Amino acid sequence: ATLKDQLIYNLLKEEQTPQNKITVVGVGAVGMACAISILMKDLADELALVDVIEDKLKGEMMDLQHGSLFLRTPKIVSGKDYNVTANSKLVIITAGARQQEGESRLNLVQRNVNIFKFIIPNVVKYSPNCKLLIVSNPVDILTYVAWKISGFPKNRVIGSGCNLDSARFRYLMGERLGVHPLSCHGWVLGEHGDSSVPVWSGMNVAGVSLKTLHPDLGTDKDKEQWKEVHKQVVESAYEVIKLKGYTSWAIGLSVADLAESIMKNLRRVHPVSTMIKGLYGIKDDVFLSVPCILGQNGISDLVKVTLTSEEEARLKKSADTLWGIQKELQF
Template sequence: MQKSASASSLGPGGLDLSDMFFKPIQNTSPPSPTKRRTKISVIGAGNVGMAIAQTILTQDLADEIALVDAQPEKLRGEMLDLQHAAAFLPRTKIMASTDYNVTVGSDLCIVSAGARQIAGESRLNLLQRNVALFRGIIPPLAKYSPGMILMIVSNPVDVLTYVAWKLSGFPSNRVVGSGTNLDSSRFRFLIADHLDVNAQDVQASIIGEHGDSSVALWSSISVGGVPVLSFLEKQQIPYEKETLISCGPRPETPLALPPPLFLELLEHSKKG
């Protein structure tokens, strides 16, 4: 004789409530048949790396996010923070490890890991320390995800992007750096603030190497497509820039907010 369902599990009309309410959550929303699964790995769980991971998560840019860092306790804490927030965000699998094998099958790897510049340290010394770190980072990433796009945001970013290209053995069109994105973002903000307009309406660029040697394209500045060079007081812009630097800007936020760039890189990786 078959055992009947317990009264506690039956609702009105004899419906089995246990089957209705206690099915695994992941099975209630089947994956889209048209969406290709995407995996993004972030190397370095510092301020910049975690800001990037949060952007990927909140913008629903990937089905999987893998975090790698050399400090296991910090890494676990950062992973838990993202996993707890994921209850209110799109369904993304979040994993973390000190081992690079967690990045296997990535479409995009973003490297933010790097040594911090010590007060009085030259960029050359910083470069030497970060090149040593990259020798242990880039080869395993290339091994576990040979078809990925590799994006570098560690400083000095332009030289380290070249180093990453050489260490990876990838074609040059699959290794990119954040370049002067941060410089251009700050430049646009300063102009927008001076003219009391929205920064999204400002078209302005910084080119060259990220850092002191970069160049502002003054002649191409426009607001809503209208040239504004004649309206700018050139002496005030450098002063405001110097003030911004002395206030101690946090570079992680503007570096982490270019979803269109992520999407373009992911689309490129899908095309191979």
């Protein structure tokens, strides 16, 4: 008789798979911010971490494990071998190079496409029925790449896209109006990057159109220069990188927001990277952000946002830029 069997009588001898497992690939600052945010939101019964830097991977895993008393995720594992990711409902990809001070996310394409050619087939091997949530940059291009490599249906390949750009826009609109961002509504669509599109025509508080109240909203003639709010959204990651070297907390919270809608099947609307072929006359297989209904099958529906002619032209410009990159990739 050991202490454990003196103390505990066992009824059930058998291993069951987890019901709500999430994997995070990449344990850099973005991956770990996604991991802690998901842990504190009680979204998973198992969290797996994967990376190729084996000591940092084990250290991050242990540091999370040591906080288990304070969490409700009873199993946290890690390994360089993708077998640790088996049976995941949601696999969040954050691995890859990140942009340095002043560098475009679009400058990361060659490196991160090559990294994805290794990661995605291994994720798909061990969790053939997962949803993929791509966070690595440039996220629109890499969501297309993950879709092409995985062979998944496009509903199950979701880019974090402009969920964060829209959150930043709502934060800045809240600061100008003195209203919590939850009650400030406004969308930034298109590329998660320099060509994103602020949809002035949809901005509102309590269903009151700000453009109807202020017809010059967003234009160069605007005495209040609201276009500067979108400029600040575009420049946000650059400013934060210049100041602290990288960004992590806001994208971790944005990714956890997306994970909550997926894992809890909420059917909330988020601007995420998806194929927009068939909207706005676009015929190319281009991925960028539009508002999507998110739940347990990933993206089940696209919202058809009415755009002004100027907003639509900007969105088509974003799509042209991204498709010019995406069309040249070779698999």
